[PDB]
């Protein structure tokens, strides 16, 4: 709630839909076993329900998207970065879904004055995109800015 990362919520909102690709309503603990087996983790029976009843606050063992933000605020324990590129990420992005996208990065070289072709701006993303989804994360934007 007061975790105060507006662009990580837009990351978590895509991340929450990964676990809940199965079904429209929220996580059902077999919907977590489906994505755990997709990684080949093969978790034991009756260890899933334990792994969800230690994140769930309000009974009803299904965990929902408000409760999902509680756990990820507790992890990724805390970062006090320069706060200037976090302002510049929100002006490079003009749709505000927390992803830079494939085309909007070409939409800023066209405005900054760089003659950059369609493939080379696609080459800019592939270097920047750790999870490889084709749109750079805000954290990928930070790791491509101040890490060097």
């Amino acid at each position: 709630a007061d975790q105060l990362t507006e662009e990580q919520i837009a990351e978590f909102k895509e991340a929450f839909s990964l676990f809940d690709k199965d079904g429209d309503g929220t996580i059902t603990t077999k919907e977590l076993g489906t994505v755990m087996r997709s990684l080949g983790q093969n978790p034991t029976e009756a260890e899933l329900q334990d792994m969800i009843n230690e994140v769930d606050a309000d009974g009803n063992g299904t965990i929902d998207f408000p409760e999902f933000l509680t756990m990820m605020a507790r992890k990724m324990k805390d970062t006090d970065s320069e706060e200037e590129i976090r302002e510049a990420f929100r002006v490079f992005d003009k749709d505000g879904n927390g992803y830079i996208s494939a085309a909007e990065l070409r939409h800023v070289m066209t405005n900054l004055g760089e003659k950059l072709t369609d493939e080379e701006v696609d080459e800019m993303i592939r270097e920047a995109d750790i999870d490889g989804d084709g749109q750079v994360n805000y954290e990928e934007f930070v790791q491509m800015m101040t890490a060097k």
């Binding site: 200037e84 590129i85 510049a88 490079f92 800023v108 070289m109 900054l112 760089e114 950059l116 080379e120 701006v121 080459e123 800019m124 270097e127 920047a128 491509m144 800015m145």
Partner: peptide
């Protein structure tokens, strides 16, 4: 390429 990211690094600085 990496050349394009060095311009976006430059413009915020």
């Amino acid at each position: 390429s990496h050349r394009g990211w060095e311009i976006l690094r430059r413009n915020t600085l």
